[PDB]
Structures are given as structure tokens and as C-alpha cells.
Amino acid sequence: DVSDFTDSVRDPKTSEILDISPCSFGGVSVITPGTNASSEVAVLYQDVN
Amino acid sequence: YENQKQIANQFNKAISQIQESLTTTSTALGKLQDVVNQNAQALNTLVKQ
Ligand SMILES: *[C@@H]1O[C@H](CO)[C@@H](O)[C@H](O)[C@H]1NC(C)=O
Numbered sequence: 001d002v003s004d005f006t007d008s009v010r011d012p013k014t015s016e017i018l019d020i021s022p023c024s025f026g027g028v029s030v031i032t033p034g035t036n037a038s039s040e041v042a043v044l045y046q047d048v049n
Numbered sequence: 050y051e052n053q054k055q056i057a058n059q060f061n062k063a064i065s066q067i068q069e070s071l072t073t074t075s076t077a078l079g080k081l082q083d084v085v086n087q088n089a090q091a092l093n094t095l096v097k098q
């Protein structure tokens with residue numbers, strides 16, 4: 001890749017070409033009504049199905 | 050009021066000319082393109098490093 005990470009590999013036993021993708025990562029945001037109002041929150045997981 | 054027809058006609062003709070100038074070719078929207086480029090140049094150096 002352009003940032004010098006390997007993205008494709010060849011299997012050393014069966015000679016099959018494999019693509020490599022990252023495991024899921026992202027940011028987490030916490031949405032709150034206010035501590036004085038309530039103790040509940042909602043969670044937003046960013047950039048994920 | 051005494052010249053309303055002429056004013057209406059040249060208003061419509063001016064809108065038609067603006068539409069043609071946007072249709073054929075436009076560097077007039079360069080400023081919105083210039084904003085787009087310096088962001089993409091900013092990230093390409095971040096991945097390069
Ligand atoms: C390597 O061994 C596996 C099973 O042990 C076999 O399926 C594969 O064909 C072998 N590869 C080569 C290049 O001999």
C-alpha cells in the first residue's frame with residue numbers, strides 16, 4: 001500500500017491470494033440529557049455497521 | 050410601467066445567458082474547487098509520512 005502496509009498475501013501452502021482488512025475501530029460518543037436532569041445516556045458508535 | 054415588456058424580456062434573456070455560461074464551461078466555480086483540493090493535499094501528506 002501507499003502507507004507501507006501489506007494488503008494482499010499469497011498462501012504458502014495452497015497458493016491462494018488473500019485480501020487483508022482491518023478489524024473494526026472507531027470513536028464512541030456519549031449523549032446525555034444532563035446529570036441534574038437524569039442519569040441515563042445514549043451511545044453513538046461512529047463509522048460502523 | 051411604461052417600459053415593462055422590455056425589462057421582462059431582458060431579464061429572461063439574462064437568466065438564459067447565465068444558464069448557458071454554466072452549461073458550457075465554468076472556471077467561475079474555481080473557488081469551491083480550490084477549497085476541495087487543499088483538503089485532499091492535506092491528507093495525502095499525512096498518509097505519506
Ligand atoms: C503443502 O501441503 C499441503 C498439505 O500438507 C498440500 O495440500 C499442498 O498442496 C502442499 N503444497 C505444495 C506446494 O506442495
Ligand SMILES: *[C@@H]1O[C@H](CO)[C@@H](O)[C@H](O)[C@H]1NC(C)=O
Nearest residue numbers: 021024025045046047048049
Ligand atoms: C449491515 O450488515 C447487515 C448484515 O450483514 C446487512 O443486512 C445490512 O444491510 C448492512 N447495512 C449496511 C451495509 O448499511
